[PDB]
Design a protein around this ligand. Structure first.
Ligand SMILES: CC(C)=CCC/C(C)=C/CC/C(C)=C/COP(=O)(O)OP(=O)(O)O
Ligand SMILES: CC(C)=CCC/C(C)=C/CC/C(C)=C/COP(=O)(O)OP(=O)(O)O
Lengths: 330, 330
């Protein structure tokens, strides 16, 4: 999809144009700057998912120019939701950089003003829905989908913040039931359920049971995507900081299920600190418990399980919708 | 309305209950805390407006228990929107206190986490709309009304932030066309248009022309409410800090229209600073230009104008809807 990703991206100037059309001129200027700095520069996978899935779902003799345009406007709505989250998350986490660039809030002259910038980005989603989809039968379903996605993601954030407060290592918090809960709400619902559900709605597939079937496949994919993401944070080939941030990682979760009382202390003494040698130490405790090996077995079991879910729950959607995602994430 | 305000407030425990009903339990706990600390302790005028206006608008033989409950749930949605804004605004402004209590973000252990708390408060609006109004014909109109209110308010904030950046006195920015624009977007739309429009929708009054008529009265009221609020910041009987915050106040606007080149300097040298004697100095420049006298004339002219607007635009709504607001604000 390098092709499909250049076409989706090229549609961005038109989204910006339509959103940034007297004395509020200067505010609309600042909105343009917020959009440009923060909705561009990622890999665009969530929004492209909308477009690809829409094409695979719709009767080919219903894809006219205006349909296709709605599909990429909705893909862009997914990207705007992402941008809202990241901008706000980066403030909350005190991050320095995003997508290799200075975080928006770290720019001179922006600072905490970025909280309202982030709100504007969210508000843009509903402005585009109304401009392009208000007369469509699925309008209200998409508004409700984006609202619900936002809520789930926010709840997930809350849970994450309570579980892993920076500067307070408390490993009793990092249970597997907690980890899974974080991932489902903070990440899997918006990343995986949102984009395909949207495409579904747009294709006229509005039934509760179908949505639920697809959700079942898609939240399981999101679980694997994040677990993988956690693994690679520490063992991928590029550097990552989950351990120097007291994160509720799949790794520390696994480590904690397999530690003796002695190891549990090595972790209690070394998790969630800045010094390289003590982060060095946890990575070495991880390799001692054969965590990469546990990951590899997990990834195999996970992949068979997803194929089973696709076999039981894809119908009557084309399996290819779910297979394409599996192929990208695995 | 001390009576009506005790009944509206008593409905709060039920709103909290319905919103805070396994492993996300701890997040839902934190949501409860956010709701309790931040949606209570104000004067509740925006949400009560919903309820009062709904009663004055609806056929009396349509106010059954479930109607009334929707009306106060929507009044509470207005209060939640307010709470979202204030929480986020207080972070942005670096404020210490709100409604005489420590600002939420200033509590130990909260800090910037409050950005996600504020998002949750906003998200609560749409959860209550869906729980109580999803089967009503006005459901989508209310979702769109709250979304649009949010956008207008955010745009207003952006404009305010650009116009009055803390630590940068630039009086060339404080024009009357700019002041009016700030007030319309940041304050008047959500405070005055939102609550009556909502009540209108709920009463079955969905027509564009009627909404526009009412908007005309209501945005003019909001202009007077804020102008008054600016005046009283400095001359009310309690202390206020617009001048020590470089605010785009109605006062500095008026002062600037009436200053000679010499006075303009007194202002350029003394506006937007912390030292009591230099704030002392601006207040004295204001009293030299007879700004309280300009305010008094403004308040009289404004009041006649609002009565004229009510006479030309209230119909077919009961004038009493608009008169009640006028009586509270004047
Ligand atoms: C339906 C179909 C056949 C689609 C085509 C395949 C496709 C575009 C899959 C994308 C899947 C996705 C949302 C991955 C998130 O990864 P990311 O690495 O972008 O995550 P990050 O943003 O968190 O880095
Ligand atoms: C329709 C009708 C007949 C209603 C009854 C009258 C009524 C409740 C009017 C309230 C008007 C209002 C929203 C004032 C905001 O002032 P505030 O001082 O609460 O503003 P602040 O929150 O910014 O201090």
């Amino acid at each position: 999809y390098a092709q499909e990703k250049q076409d989706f991206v090229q549609h961005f100037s038109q989204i910006v144009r339509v959103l940034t059309e007297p004395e509020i001129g200067d505010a609309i200027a600042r909105l343009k700057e917020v959009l440009e700095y923060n909705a561009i520069g990622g890999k665009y996978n969530r929004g492209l998912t909308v477009v690809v899935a829409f094409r695979e779902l719709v009767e080919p003799r219903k894809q006219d120019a205006d349909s296709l345009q709605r599909a990429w406007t909705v893909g862009w709505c997914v990207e705007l939701l992402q941008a809202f989250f990241l901008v706000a998350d980066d403030i909350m986490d005190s991050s320095l950089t995003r997508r290799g660039q200075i975080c928006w809030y770290q720019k001179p002259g922006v600072g905490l003003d970025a909280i309202n910038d982030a709100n504007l980005l969210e508000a843009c989603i509903y402005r585009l829905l109304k401009l392009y989809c208000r007369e469509q039968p699925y309008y209200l379903n998409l508004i409700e989908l984006f609202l619900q996605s936002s809520y789930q993601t926010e709840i997930g954030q809350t849970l994450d913040l309570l579980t892993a407060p920076q500067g307070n290592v408390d490993l009793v918090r990092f249970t597997e039931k907690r980890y899974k809960s974080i991932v489902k709400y903070k990440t899997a619902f918006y990343s995986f359920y949102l984009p395909i559900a949207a495409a579904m709605y747009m294709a006229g597939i509005d039934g509760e049971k179908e949505h639920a079937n697809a959700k079942k496949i898609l939240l399981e994919m999101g679980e694997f995507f994040q677990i993988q993401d956690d693994y690679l944070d520490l063992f991928g080939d590029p550097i990552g900081t989950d351990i120097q941030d007291n994160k509720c990682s799949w790794l520390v979760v696994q480590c904690l299920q397999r530690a003796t009382p002695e190891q549990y202390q090595i972790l209690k003494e070394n998790y969630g600190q800045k010094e390289a040698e003590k982060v060095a130490r946890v990575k070495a405790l991880y390799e001692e418990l054969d965590l990469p090996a546990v990951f590899l077995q997990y990834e195999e079991d996970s992949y068979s399980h997803i194929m089973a879910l696709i076999e039981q729950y894809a119908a009557p959607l084309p399996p290819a919708v779910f297979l394409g995602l599996a192929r990208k994430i695995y």
